[PDB]
């Protein structure tokens with residue numbers, strides 16, 4: 001099954017954290033990366049003191065069940081998501097979100113697929129459109145149609 005995973009990091013210098021997470025995704029059992037979007041920069045919209053986010057999308061081929069894939073993404077967040085710089089580990093700065101999982105619809109306590117808010121997030125839709133422009137959602141909405149309707153601002157490459 002082709003799962004599409006959004007990866008974001010708001011560390012001040014996030015390239016090494018993002019690469020550690022991508023390496024970790026490729027090492028998930030019974031799975032392997034098919035394609036990775038470019039890295040994109042998303043400035044914060046409200047308070048300008050928060051760092052920019054680095055955002056990307058990953059196509060992962062996997063035979064795992066959806067909740068099993070979520071277990072691994074959450075393990076990676078626990079293992080790689082915090083960075084130490086001086087005397088303490090900072091807060092979690094890495095987010096891994098399952099956007100789509102084949103054409104399955106999931107609505108459990110733990111997992112909502114398609115991701116509940118991806119249709120409002122250019123930082124999710126634009127990297128996904130780069131790697132899967134013909135993507136169709138389980139209910140028949142088209143990724144191109146969503147971007148056409150909202151005319152989201154394009155994001156700069158990192």
Ligand SMILES: Nc1nc2[nH]cc(CCCN3CC[C@@H](SC[C@H]4O[C@@H](n5cnc6c(N)ncnc65)[C@H](O)[C@@H]4O)C[C@@H]3C(=O)O)c2c(=O)[nH]1
Pocket residue numbers: 007008042053055095096097098099109110111112113114115116117123
């Ligand atoms: N520029 C920019 N880039 C950005 N990147 C990412 C963000 C916000 C990340 C916030 N995001 C982090 C992961 C989860 S954490 C909560 C619970 O959600 C459950 N869950 C349900 N369905 C899920 C699914 N499909 N995948 C993964 N978890 C899923 C899970 O059980 C967990 O316990 C959702 C949360 C959110 O999006 O609400 C952001 C930004 O703000 N700005």
